[PDB]
């Protein structure tokens, strides 16, 4: 019954301006000593505090980003906003808005966090990946290579999921402004290339669906 829900664009280009919103309920930052604020976190990385707004309109900022930040509020439609100007690829992160009071009764701490929202600052345009098989040069390992796609995400299976044990599908990474990812499969040698091993890959945003059988060199 006390909740925080972050709203964002999803995506925007560098040197543009990010506008975030946070829908409060189960409480007012109207009430004395109440405050709400923002903390973000790049994929797989640390937590960076950004800004906090108090019931009385007092505001606090991170020195690093004193020029880019701009926290605001709206007492009766019950919402809090933040904007970062001239954004860039490093501002790509998950953004949480959290609650915190400056008095010992309402809870002087970050007890309540919203589930968050992903902002990704990219100049990329939708791009479909190129899907490549990786056959080897006593169990045998094969792989799939899915390269240069934007945006996230792609999905991968092997033999449409009937294969699963000994599969490692790796976190995707940036190459230029495109994502590349890979997956591997391991089976006993008395299986491949005697049986057939298909790699199945999707990239919904470009409607791309590829099924790539591996073959021996």
Residues that bind other proteins (CB under 8 A): 33, 46-49, 52, 54, 58, 60-64, 96, 100, 102-104, 108-111, 113-116, 130, 132-137, 141, 143, 145, 147, 168, 170-173, 175, 180-182, 184, 186, 217
- Nearest CB to other proteins, comparing residues 77 and 171: 171
- Nearest CB to other proteins, comparing residues 123 and 170: 170
- Nearest CB to other proteins, comparing residues 15 and 109: 109
- For the bound state, the minimum distance from the C-beta of residue 173 to other proteins, rounded and expressed in Å, comes to 5
Please report the sign of the dihedral spanned by the C-alpha atoms of residue 56, residue 62, residue 63, residue 66: negative
- For the bound state, the minimum distance from the C-beta of residue 64 to other proteins, rounded and expressed in Å, comes to 7
- For the bound state, the minimum distance from the C-beta of residue 17 to other proteins, rounded and expressed in Å, comes to 22
- Nearest CB to other proteins, comparing residues 13 and 45: 45
State how far the Cα of 69 lies from the Cα of 105, in Å rounded to an integer: 29
Q: Are the C-beta atoms of residues 186 and 144 closer than 8 Å to each other? A: no
- For the bound state, the minimum distance from the C-beta of residue 13 to other proteins, rounded and expressed in Å, comes to 23
- For the bound state, the minimum distance from the C-beta of residue 29 to other proteins, rounded and expressed in Å, comes to 14
State how far the Cα of 152 lies from the Cα of 90, in Å rounded to an integer: 17
DSSP assignment string, 83-144? EESS--GGG-EEEEEEE--SSTTT-SS---B---EEEEE-----B--EEEEE----EEEEEE
In sequence order, the 6+-apart residues with CB closer than 8 A to the CB of 92 are 42, 43, 119, 120, 121, 122
- Nearest CB to other proteins, comparing residues 15 and 166: 166
- Nearest CB to other proteins, comparing residues 76 and 161: 161
- For the bound state, the minimum distance from the C-beta of residue 159 to other proteins, rounded and expressed in Å, comes to 19
CA distances from 157 to 26, 60, 136, 191, 197 (A): 43, 47, 19, 18, 11
């Amino acid at each position: 019954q006390v909740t925080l829900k972050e709203s964002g664009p999803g995506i925007l280009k560098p040197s543009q301006t990010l506008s975030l919103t946070c829908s409060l309920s189960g409480f007012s930052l109207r009430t004395s000593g109440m405050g709400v604020g923002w903390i973000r976190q790049p994929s797989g990385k640390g937590l960076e505090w950004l800004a906090h707004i108090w019931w009385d309109d007092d505001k606090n900022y991170n020195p690093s980003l004193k020029s880019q930040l701009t926290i605001s509020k709206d007492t009766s439609r019950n919402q809090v906003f933040l904007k970062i100007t001239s954004v860039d690829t490093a501002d790509t992160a998950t953004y949480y808005c959290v609650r915190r009071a400056h008095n010992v009764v309402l809870g002087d701490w970050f007890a309540y966090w919203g589930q968050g929202t992903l902002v990704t600052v990219s100049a990329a345009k939708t791009t479909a990946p190129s899907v490549y098989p990786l056959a080897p040069v006593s169990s045998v390992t094969l792989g799939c290579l899915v390269k240069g796609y934007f945006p996230e995400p792609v999905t991968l299976t092997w033999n449409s999921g009937s294969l699963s044990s000994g599969v490692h599908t790796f976190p995707a990474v940036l190459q230029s402004d495109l994502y590349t990812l890979s997956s591997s499969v391991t089976v006993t040698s008395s299986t491949w290339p005697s049986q057939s091993i298909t790699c199945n890959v999707a990239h919904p945003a470009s409607s791309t669906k590829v099924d790539k059988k591996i073959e021996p060199r």
